[PDB]
Structure formats: C-alpha cells, structure tokens
From a paper:
Cytoplasmic dynein is a microtubule motor vital for cellular organization and division. It functions as a ~4 MDa complex containing its cofactor dynactin and a cargo-specific coiled-coil adaptor. The formation of dynein-dynactin-adaptor (DDA) complexes is a key regulatory step in dynein activation. Here, we determine the cryo-electron microscopy structure of dynein-dynactin on microtubules with LIS1 and the lysosomal adaptor JIP3.
In addition, in the DDJ1-560 structure the C-terminal JIP3 residues 374-550, encompassing the LZII and RH2 coiled coils, bind at dynactin’s pointed end, with the intervening disordered residues 186-373 not visible. With JIP31-560, density corresponding to two coiled coils (~12 nm and ~6 nm long) docks against dynactin’s pointed-end subunits Arp11, p25, p27 and p62. Based on the dimensions, we assigned the longer coiled coil to the LZII and the shorter one to the RH2 domain. Connected to LZII is a stretch of density containing a short alpha helix which docks onto p25 at the site where the Spindly motif (LΦXEΦ, where Φ is hydrophobic) binds in other adaptor structures. Upon searching the sequences flanking LZII, we found a JIP3 sequence, LYHEL (residues 382-386), that matches the Spindly motif consensus and explains our cryo-EM density. To support this assignment, we performed gel filtration assays to assess the interaction of JIP3 with a recombinantly-expressed pointed end complex. These showed that whereas JIP31-560 binds the pointed end, mutations in the putative Spindly motif (L382A/Y383A/ E385A) disrupt this interaction. However, the crystal structure of Arf6 bound to the JIP3 paralog, JIP4 (59), suggests Arf6 would sterically hinder LZII’s interaction with the pointed end. We conclude that when JIP3 is on cargos, it binds the pointed end via its Spindly motif whereas the LZII binds Arf6 and is detached from dynactin. Our data suggest LZII detaches from the pointed end upon cargo binding.
Numbering used by the authors:
A (entry chain W): 1 to 179
B (entry chain X): 374 to 467, 518 to 551
C (entry chain J): 12 to 390
D (entry chain U): 8 to 70, 77 to 182
E (entry chain Y): 2 to 88, 106 to 170, 219 to 376, 388 to 435, 448 to 464
F (entry chain x): 410 to 467, 518 to 551
Write the structure that this text describes.
C-alpha cells in the first residue's frame, strides 16, 4: 500500500550535487532563476517557468509528469511584475496540473489533473483532490480538503498529516531506483 | 547533502555544459557569466544566508505571537472567574465609539499587512 | 442561560438553527455521503433496522452540529420539531442519539402543527402540512390538537417527482449534441431526484381552477373535441452540459393536476380539509374554517394557494358538503415567514421561553433512569 | 509559410507548423503547438497564446476546400487549452484546460471557462460566460473586458530569455 | 495520506461499538491505556476562523454576527468568495462573472463598510410575539411552583388578519418563455432562507460562513485527546495524542498472485525508541468476532525487538521470517492460504506488543488488525 | 562600483531590519514575562479568594485593543517609509 519500485532510465534523469532528479524532457525556461534546494524530483515534460520570477521549491518535492508551474500576474499600484511563488517543503504535485499559484505552503498533496488559478494561496498541510478547478485569489485553510468543480470546501484531513507526508515523499524518493 | 542549496539550477546543471544548453533550456543569450571573485561571491553569499537568518527570526516572531495571544486568552478567563467569585464572596459577606475606533484600526492594520507581506515578496525577488 | 437549538428533521430538507431568531441558520437536504457511495443516502427512513438509522443520524447531527451550528452539544436544550403521527421507533432512535451520543440537557418533542399555529398569536386554526411524502391536515382548537379529525393522503413531493418522471419518460425529447440533435426518447434509464426537483421548482407551475378543470376534461376526452386551452411554451432544460431536454408545455401545467384529480373517491388536496371539518364538533366549524394556514414546502409552488382557495370554493357547492359545511367563509392566513419555515419559526418562538422549557420537556436524567420517551399512545 | 508581422515576439520553442499568418503584436509562449493541417491560420492583433494552446485545423482528418481560421484581436488562450474554431472574434478569453469543438463560431467578448468541454453546432452570442466542467451555464456580461498591459509588459522581458522566430518585412 | 491507500489496514477499536478504523483517524488515550476512534469520542469547539481571511474571532462576537464573517461575501452563482474591485467599489466573482450590478445595488465609496444585508421585514411582529409569549410563559410559570408549594401589567398583541382572497397567479406565467439564467435553482434559493427569491435579480450575496477548530475529549476520563492551537495557520498543537505516535503500524508492499497459496511480506514500523512486538497470535479460533475474515494466515513468529534512532541485527537473521531490518522498520513474512470466497481477500490477525504506561513499560496490549488485499 | 554600492546598501538595510526584529523580540519577551508573572499572582489571589470563602462558608477592552493597534500602526509606519526607499532603490 506504500509506493512501489518506480523505475526510470539512467540516461534520462540528471542527478545533481544536492540530490535533485530532473528529467531531460522537462523544459524549464530560464534556469538561472529556478532554485531547487533539496532532493526534489521533476518528472518528464514538466514545464517550469523560471522566466518572469524566481521559483523556489522545498526539500522533497515531487512534481509529476506533464504538469506546468508558473508565476502569476498582479496589477500593482505603481508598476507590474510577476509574483515569485515559493513552494514549501514536502509537496506532492501530481500529474497534468496547471499551477498559477502564489505561496504554496508546505506538506501539501495536490491531486491529479487540476487547475490552480492566479494568485491562489495554499496554506500548510492541506490537500486538493482530483479534477478540481480553483478560481483566482482563493485561500485554502490548513487540514482542509478542497474539491469540486468551483473548488469548494469538502472535508477535513486527519490531524497527523505532518507525521505522514514526510514518510510518503521520503519513501517515494527512496523507491526511485534507476533501471 | 546539506539542508539547503541556494546554488539555483544553472550552476547545478552546468557540470557538463551540454544538457542545460540542449534539453531543459534554451541556454543561450546570457552566456556571459559573473566572475565569482574570491570576495564578490563570498560576500554575495553573506547576504544569502543572512536573509535566511532574517527569515528564522520572522518565524520565531510568528511563534511567540501565538504565545502572547494565547496568554491573553487565559488572562481574561481568570479575570471573569475572579469577578464572579468576588461577587459571590461579597454576597456571602453581607464604549461603542472606542470599539468602532478599534474596528477601524483593525481594518487599517489588515491593509498594512497586506501591503507589507507582498512588498517583502517583491523585495525577495529583487534581492537576486 | 444560553439559547436553545431548534432542529426540524424533514424528509427532503432539514431546517436548523438557534432559537429566538427570525429565520433558520441552515436549510440543507437530509442526505449524507459515505466513503465509496456514488449517491448520497437519505438519512430519514421508516421501518428499517435500528443501528443503521442510529449511525446515519449520528453522522447527520454531527455534520449539523459542527458545520452549520458552531456550538458545543452539552450546553443547551434542543427543540426537535417532528410531525404528528411520526413513527415511534424513529422518535426513539432520534432521542437515543440526542441523549446517549451528544448528551444534551433536554430535548422537547414538538408537533409541527401547533407551532405552525404559534407564529400568528391565534389559538385555533385548520393546519395543513404539504410535505415531501404526506399531505397531512389537522385541526388545532384552543391549543388542543384534535386527533380524532386527522386526514392524510400521499400527495407530497414524492408523488410529484414520480409523476414528473412518468410524463418525462412518456415524452422525452433530448438532444445529445454528437450528431444526435433530433428527437431521442429516453436514452437514460432514470432521471435523478435532484434534476427532477430542479425541473419541478424551476419550470413547473400550478394552473387555475377553470383552466385545470378543462385540462382534466381534455385529458378525459369525454366528448371533448380538442377543448384544451393554450399551453405554455416548451422549455429547453440542460442536463450535464451537452444533453438538452425539451420539456413540453403540457407537462408544466398538467403534472400538478394529480393533487386535484377527482377519480370518484373524492380524495384530493382540498377534499381532506372538508373531510376533517365534517368530523369536527359543531361549535368549532365557523372559526375553524375562518382560519386556514397552509404550511409545507410544496405550498410555494406559484398559484397553489389561489388554486386551493378556488378549489375549496368550487367543492363547497357539492351536495355532500352543502347540508353540513355549505354556508362557510374560507380565509387563508399569511404567516410571517415563508411556508417552508413556519413550523420552524414557531419552534424558535417556543424555544426562547426559558422559564418553561426545562419543565415542559424530557430531561436527560429522566431518560437515563427511565429510558422511555412519552407519546400520545398508551403507557 | 510562417508569415510573421514585425513587432510580435514569437519564441522558437513553440511548435508552429503549416501556413500561419501571425499579426503585429502577438506573444507566443514556449510549448505552444499551433499546427495548420487543411488550411491557413490567421492570427490578428495581440492574441497572447500562452503555453499549451493546441490549435488544430484538421477538420476532414478527424471525421477544393481551403477552409481557414480567422482569429481576431486580443484573444488570449491560457495553459493547456484546445482550440478548434474556423471563425473567432475579438477581445475574448478562453481559459485553462478548456476544449472547444470544431463547429463553434465566436463573436466578441465571451469567456470560455476552465475545463468546459463544449462541442455544439452553435454560434456563441455576445459576452456569454460558460463555466464549470459539469454543465455550460451562460451568464451575460455587460462590459467587454480589456487586456493590453500584460502583453506590453511581455514585449520587454521575453527576448532576453528566449530566442526569436524569423520575421519578414 | 491518501497516496498510500490507508483503508487497506484497519484496526478494531474496543468500546460500546466495535468499529474498524484506519490509523490516521485513531487517537490513543494515555490514562486509560486504550485507543479511541473518532465515532466513540467526544467533540468540542475551540475557535471560529473565516477561511478567506484567516483571522480568529471570539464566540460572543460570532453569536452577535450570526456565524458570519464581517468582510467576506460568497456569490449566489457558485459558492466562491467574492472580491472587491475598483472602477467606486463593487463586488465581482472569479469563477463566474457575476458582478454586484446584476442585483442592482449601487457602488459603495468605501470598500468594506458600505455593504450590509437588508433586515427581515417581519422582525417587528416576531419581537412583539416573543415579548407577548414571554409574558404568557411567566403567567404559566407562576402557577406550577404555587401548585408545588400547595402540595408541599398585561400585554395583548393584535393577531394576524386572514384574507378572503389571496394574490393569484400572474398571467405572464402563461404564454411567455421562461429564462433559466433569470430563475434560480433550489440550492442557491435555499441559501437565503429569510426570503427565497424566484428571480436572480433579488438574490443578494451572503457573508462567508466560518469553520471550527475542534478539540477532542475522551469519554471515560475527561482529558484532552487533541487540543489544537488557537491561532489559525498553525500546524503544531498544544497537546496531541494520535495513534501513529504511539502504536506500531503494519504496512504491505508485496502482494503475490491468488492461486490458493501466498507468502506475502509486511513491515512493522515504530514510534517508541525501544519496543517489542509479536504477531504470534493467529486470531484465536473464531473468537473476538473476526467476522470480516476471508482467508487463513499462519503468521507464526517469536517476539521481535525493534529500535528507533533519531547482534540484534547480525545474529537473529531468519530470512524466511524476518525479511529485512532497517531503522525502526522490520519486514515479516506471512503465509496466506487465500481466496476462500469468490473475491475480496481479507486477513484478520492479532498483534501483541509492549507500551510504557508512565514496571510501567511492561503494559502489554493486543491489537486486532484486519488487513485487506486486492484479490 | 555601482553594483557593489547598491548591494552594500542592501547589507545595511537587512542589518537594520535584523536589528529591529530582535528589538521587537525583546519588547515582546518582556511583556510575555510580565503576563506569566501576572497570571501567577492572579492564581495566588484566586487560591486566597477560594480558601477564605470556604472558611467564611464554614471600555477596558476598548482602550487595550486600541493601545495595541496604535503600536501596530507605528510599527507598520517605520516600515512603509523604509521600503518605499528600498523600492526606489530598485528603481535607481
Ligand atoms: N421554493 C420552493 N418552491 C417549490 N417547491 C419547493 C421549494 N422548496 C422546496 N420545495 C419542494 O418541497 C418539498 C419539500 O417540502 P418540505 O421542505 O416541507 O418537506 P420536509 O419537511 O423535508 O418533509 P416532511 O414534511 O415529509 O418531513 C420537495 O418536493 C421540494 O422540492
Ligand atoms: Zn473573512
Ligand atoms: Zn461565483
Ligand atoms: Zn481516557
């Protein structure tokens, strides 16, 4: 019931000095601004927009395949820019997502094939289910399941998400063996 | 490795010089790098760990602001029990305007925080 | 003293909130969603087994008490509005979850009919609950519910949903939108209840008396050569995006005529008012028929009260009621809330009387060392 | 066959195939697959194509005949969207991960929302907002919305991070 | 939490009702050495916080404001928090494009203090009836205590006037097409229970509902099982007592085929720094109600010591019994004779261990673990 | 020259911000010590008022929140005048 031996090709992924595993087909535009500190995984064709802002993810972050993360756009008082989104530690972004969020918190599972709108704030230890749409400028609370097609509150998480999400993403990093 | 790595992704993927150019990036145009002067790079990294030194002081400030607001929840409960016990012992022995001002101040503080919070994210952006 | 909590477990919609307010804090459908079930289940079910109803009611008043009410359970008295002749094992299981699980101070089992009467200041009226399942009439006379003259017919919202499903599968005309834009009759098996009640509260309406009698005569075709009046235009209602169902205009004014179908038993909605009135004592009839209140969530169909008053004034000239209830004046009260929450508004009026609420109710210590709820039946 | 007017920043990582006519002030993001199969594409003034806006002119392949597409003025396509429409108006947004089917005509100023698979043989009326994956649910908007200032920001930041497409005069 | 399919292992709680719960939804009391499920334990209310602006606000202020936030509004179209917008200020939604000018209210010159709900029109009659019936409840109050001791200013309200002719159906319902955008559905109609409008031009937006930080109290000994922190956006609790910080958990990774013999592997994980475990009980002989069993496990082992860190591994190897010994994690092989039914192979077996009560570390608890396979 | 002077401005600005965060930390640690000493003397006063009762049986909120909020506004102030100069130090 925990995660199995997912196998990857040894020539496909580049294992860096700190422990990051990035695929070659993951296009990531403007690599001088993207900061990937811990032992993160960026899967195949995961489009990372390090143009227009700086993307800083946490320690054991799994970005799955064909999912797009990008900064949002905000009309300023004086002069416009793009907000630097800062993904927290131990964040499990699933496949085929669109992320336009600003300040995703730590220890969040983000479910499969979902759209998070512009300047949406994710707080710590929350959860977004599958096939949801979040509207722009929404804040989700801690220990909260947000689901549904307008992105409503649906249910309540267990209180031991902090003792579980570390074990889930560390077992997913340790079950990543090359072929 | 260590707990954090602020070496971006270009300096982590520039070990071979071919994969960052071909696959994961365009990689061109800004081919001119920045000489990491023995002291320019070190005293540039001196800002980069001191901003984390500011961030840990910020989250410990947010830790002790939980404790102060929790202590004032237990001051007034013992005060409300103290007044009820004082009235029982005594019987055994025998501003809207200000509140509105408070509300206004609260709204203003909220606005200030909203401006602050962001502006520190834009100052986080232009530090690099 | 803290304010009381007033809960009415309806069949379709549960009405809930604090006592003394001018309206309910929530109106929700009375369903719960378990893990793995693709459909939500109705929480109120009569003559089913005990522990399943206990678990469903435990999850529903836990959802009700920590999502809409935001308040502790062990602090305040509960006024539980139930129908007259509600089933006794359902009342026993509802008191068992409200005393053994939540451990409240005192529930008070309250009839909906007498605190439908309580919101006007009057003490004697004819009262009619047009609920989801029943259409239950009662006389209340000087604070006494007259139980000898009750009358119930199964002409609630469930019969309207079954009739709407029957005429929609009789004349189904959907457009799929996948090069199937012509008439495609009944490509789905059963229409769900939420879409059926959305068609019923968004499109359907209630015709007049003289139009509805000609609609019944044209459906009868007893030498009526196309003598129907002009129907309303057809309504294109959507289901799940691409499916467009053309609801015909005959359905929108002919699906509600089963409330006023005669069919030689004289059992319609307006006949049980006179059928309850003919068993009354003769000193009560004038100021029982001068005060009619109509409660229940069916009653905010548009034109329903005017059709009911014209059907009462048409049925008074029948010779079965001309000798007894012939020369009567029928008037309808206006309750100060909407007709879904008149029984709730009187329950919230009754819950604010804190001096008598501890004495007119069942204490939790009384439930601890008796275990038996009072009823109107024998003990 | 790629006729790009001057002033329009088009990056090189976007897969552009077939006869297209790119207008004066457009912005094309990376991984933007615009493929012309049966006829040409005409994209007008300032339509900011953003990320995977998959635009396909294979009408006879899926089911003379030139049969082009006309795309108007400030038509922003968001991330992961799927557009297939032989006539399209001006000043109108479609949103992220939406599907537009083949025989949909669009006039000015309408919102197609997130994840609404719409496929009907129907001209969309003026300023109708289709929302939700479940159903369609039109609501009128009284005001046609503007979008200029993000792409006048986006002219100045894209060519120092990306290479540029070829441009005729 | 849901990435591992956490309903595959279930634990039998012991109380008045014996339910099976996953270990993420279980709490362990310390004074009574017994784990407690969520359905057999008591719930409390700590604080009220708005989900849009995450700020705490007290209980009497929530009773004054009728469980509604003072600043945030939910739209009538979807259920999404509206946002203010300048031209001078008006409310608009992000998911649908519902603005504040659809219902027809004017733009407020200030952004927060100008929007308020209309009052109920029949609150004067409701207050007059409440102040009449409280006087009548006092007049019924003074007789029953007088009857009890015998055993041992008037206000009248004008009532409601009934009408002999109610307002009929309008003639524009006949011979006019309805507009489904203009009329409202029942779900957004019943979110305004004071007045339920037919048209969408009379459906004003409501304020945002609040949520509850929940404390949990054990029903045998009244102590806090999980009290959260009062300030929102907090992850740390004031006191937590959760089962995944006290009890050992079993987990599966190796499911072979269902050809009426299997040798599967589990892992036992650890929370204590040093503990002992034993899976030696084979769920007795039809005892303890193992009614969900559909297979037969051998599962025979001696007690295994387990060590967490922040000659026990070299000498007792036993590779058919103990598969691997990492840090705080020991794999154990179980021999299953599965598929006794048509499908849905489940195995019930008991788990004995040791816990520190705080001698006190020799408190031995038996845990009935029912685990399910994919069959 | 210009980049060195520009980020040596930033070292000094972050050093003054790290100074005022520590001064606010000292100023709230003092009032946390005052609150725990005051709730200890109120616990002592409550056991005295419980025991002597057993032997015998044998706009404030406004003002307070207001002071605190004025303090908060002052803090925000000594910040939006500094970071406007930091934001024009972006602008140059
Ligand atoms: N505004 C409305 N207009 C028309 N019909 C409505 C309206 N609101 C609810 N209904 C219908 O009224 C019925 C529910 O009535 P009501 O709420 O009085 O029942 P209940 O209290 O749940 O049930 P019961 O009295 O049988 O316990 C359903 O058929 C529902 O679709
Ligand atoms: Zn709020
Ligand atoms: Zn909305
Ligand atoms: Zn206990």
């Amino acid at each position: 019931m925990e995660l199995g031996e997912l196998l990857y090709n040894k020539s496909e992924y580049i294992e860096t000095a700190s422990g990051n595993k990035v695929s070659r087909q993951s296009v990531l535009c403007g690599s001088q601004n993207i900061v990937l500190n811990g032992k993160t995984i960026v899967m195949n064709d995961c489009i990372i927009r390090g143009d227009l802002a700086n993307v800083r993810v946490g320690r054991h972050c799994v970005v799955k395949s064909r999912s797009v993360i990008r900064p949002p756009f905000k009309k300023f008082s004086k002069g416009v820019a793009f907000f630097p989104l800062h993904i927290g530690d131990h964040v499990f972004i699933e496949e085929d997502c669109v992320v336009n969020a600003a300040q995703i918190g730590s220890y969040v599972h983000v479910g499969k094939n979902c759209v998070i709108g512009r300047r949406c704030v994710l707080k710590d230890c929350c959860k977004i289910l599958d096939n949801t749409v979040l509207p722009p400028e929404t804040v989700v609370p801690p220990f909260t399941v947000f689901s549904g097609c307008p992105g409503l509150f649906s249910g309540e998480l267990p209180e031991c998400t902090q003792e579980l999400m570390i074990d889930v993403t560390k077992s997913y990093y340790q079950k990543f063996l090359p072929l | 490795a260590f707990g954090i790595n602020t070496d971006s992704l270009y300096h982590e993927l520039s070990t071979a010089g071919s994969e960052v150019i071909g696959d994961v990036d365009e990689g061109a145009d800004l081919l001119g790098e920045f000489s990491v002067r023995d002291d320019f790079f070190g005293m540039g990294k001196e800002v980069g760990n001191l901003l984390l030194e500011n961030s840990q002081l910020l989250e410990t400030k947010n830790a002790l602001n939980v404790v102060k607001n929790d202590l004032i929840a237990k001051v007034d409960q013992l005060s409300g029990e103290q007044e009820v016990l004082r009235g029982e012992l005594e019987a055994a022995k025998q501003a809207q305007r200000r509140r509105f001002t408070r509300v206004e101040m609260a709204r203003v503080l909220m606005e200030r925080n909203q401006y602050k919070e962001r502006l520190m994210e834009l100052q986080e952006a232009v530090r690099w | 003293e803290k304010t009381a909590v007033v809960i009415d477990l309806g069949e379709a919609f549960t009405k809930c909130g604090f006592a003394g307010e001018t309206g309910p804090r929530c109106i929700i459908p009375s369903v719960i969603k378990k893990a793995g079930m693709p459909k939500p289940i109705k929480v109120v079910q009569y003559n089913i087994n005990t522990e399943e109803l206990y678990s469903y009611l435990k999850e529903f008043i836990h959802i009700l008490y920590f999502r809409h009410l935001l308040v502790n359970p062990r602090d305040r008295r509960v006024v539980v509005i139930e129908s007259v002749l509600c089933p006794s094992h359902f009342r026993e299981t509802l008191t068992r979850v409200l005393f053994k699980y939540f451990e409240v101070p005192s529930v008070l089992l309250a009839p909906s009919h007498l605190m439908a009467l309580l919101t006007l200041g009057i003490n004697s009226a004819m009262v009619l609950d047009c609920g989801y399942r029943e259409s239950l009439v009662l006389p209340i006379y000087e604070g006494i519910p007259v139980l000898n003259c009750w009358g119930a017919l199964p002409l609630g919202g469930k019969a309207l949903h079954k009739e709407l499903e029957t005429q929609l599968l009789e004349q189904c005309t959907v457009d799929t939108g996948a090069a199937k834009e012509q008439s495609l009759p009944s490509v789905m098996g059963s229409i769900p209840e939420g879409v059926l009640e959305d068609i019923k509260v968004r499109t359907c309406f209630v015709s007049d008396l003289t139009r509805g009698l000609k609609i019944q005569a044209a459906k009868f075709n007893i030498d009526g050569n196309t003598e129907r009046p002009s129907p309303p235009p057809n309504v294109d209602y959507p289901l799940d995006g691409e499916k467009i169902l053309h609801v015909l205009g005959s359905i929108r004014d002919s699906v509600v005529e089963i409330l006023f179908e005669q069919d030689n038993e004289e059992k319609s909605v307006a006949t049980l008012i006179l059928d309850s009135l003919m068993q009354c004592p003769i000193d009560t009839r004038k100021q029982l028929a001068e005060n009619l209140v109509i409660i229940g969530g069916t009653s905010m169909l548009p034109g329903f009260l005017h059709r009911l008053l014209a059907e009462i004034r048409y049925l008074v000239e029948k010779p079965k009621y001309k000798k007894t209830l012939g020369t009567k004046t029928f008037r309808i009260h206006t309750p100060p809330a909407k007709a879904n929450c008149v029984a709730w508004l009187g329950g919230a009026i009754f819950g604010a009387l804190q001096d008598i609420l501890g004495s007119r109710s069942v204490s939790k210590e009384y439930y601890n060392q008796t275990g038996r709820i009072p009823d109107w039946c024998s003990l | 066959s790629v006729k790009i007017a001057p002033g329009a920043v088009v990056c090189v990582e976007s897969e552009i195939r077939g006869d297209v006519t790119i207008g004066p002030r457009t912005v094309i993001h990376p991984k933007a697959r615009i493929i012309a199969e049966a006829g040409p594409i005409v994209i007008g003034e300032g339509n900011l194509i953003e990320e995977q806006a998959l635009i396909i002119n294979a009408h006879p392949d899926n089911i003379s005949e030139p049969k082009p597409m006309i795309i108007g003025t400030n038509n922003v396509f968001e991330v992961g969207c799927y557009s297939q429409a032989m006539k399209m108006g001006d000043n109108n947004v479609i949103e992220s991960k939406a599907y537009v089917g083949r025989n949909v005509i669009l006039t000015s100023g309408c919102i197609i929302g997130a994840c609404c698979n719409l496929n009907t043989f129907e001209v969309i009326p003026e300023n109708t907002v289709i929302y939700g994956a479940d159903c369609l649910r039109r609501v009128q908007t009284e005001r046609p919305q503007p979008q200029t200032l993000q792409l006048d920001f986006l002219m100045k930041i894209l060519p120092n991070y990306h290479h540029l497409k070829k441009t005729m005069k | 939490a849901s990435l591992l399919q956490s309903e595959r292992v279930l634990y039998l709680v012991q109380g008045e009702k014996k339910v099976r719960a996953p270990l993420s939804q279980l709490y362990f009391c310390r004074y009574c050495s017994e784990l407690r499920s969520l359905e057999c334990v008591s719930h409390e209310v700590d604080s009220h916080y708005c989900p849009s602006c995450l700020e705490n606000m007290p209980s009497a202020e929530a009773k004054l404001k009728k469980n509604r936030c003072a600043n945030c509004f939910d739209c009538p179209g979807c259920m999404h928090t509206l946002s203010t917008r300048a031209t001078a200020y008006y409310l608009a939604c992000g998911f649908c494009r519902w603005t504040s000018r659809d219902v027809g209210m004017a733009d407020k010159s200030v952004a927060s203090g100008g929007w308020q709900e209309p009052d109920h029109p029949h609150t004067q009659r409701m207050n007059k009836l409440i102040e009449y019936y409280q006087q009548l409840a006092q007049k019924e109050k003074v007789e029953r205590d007088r009857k009890k001791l015998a055993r041992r200013k008037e206000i009248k309200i004008e009532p409601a006037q009934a009408v002999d002719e109610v307002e009929p159906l309008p003639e524009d319902y006949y011979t006019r097409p309805v507009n489904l955008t203009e009329v409202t559905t029942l779900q957004q109609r019943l979110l305004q229970p004071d007045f339920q409008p037919i048209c969408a031009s009379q459906l004003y937006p409501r304020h945002k509902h609040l949520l509850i930080k929940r404390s949990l109290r054990c029903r045998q000994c009244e102590h806090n099982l999980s009290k959260p922190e009062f300030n929102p956006t907090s992850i740390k609790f004031k006191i937590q007592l959760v089962a995944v910080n006290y009890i050992p958990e079993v987990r599966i990774m190796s499911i072979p085929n269902l050809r009426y013999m299997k040798e599967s592997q589990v892992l036992l994980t650890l929370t204590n720094p040093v503990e002992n475990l034993t899976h030696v009980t084979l769920l007795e002989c039809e005892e303890g109600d193992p009614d969900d069993t559909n297979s037969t496990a051998k599962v025979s082992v001696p007690p295994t010591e387990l060590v967490l860190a922040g000659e026990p591994q070299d000498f007792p190897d036993d590779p058919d019994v103990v598969a691997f010994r990492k840090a705080n994690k020991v794999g154990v092989f179980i021999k299953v004779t599965p598929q006794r039914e048509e499908g849905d192979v489940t195995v019930c077996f008991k788990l004995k261990h040791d816990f520190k009560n705080l001698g006190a570390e020799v408190s031995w608890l038996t845990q009935h673990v029912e685990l399910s396979l994919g069959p």
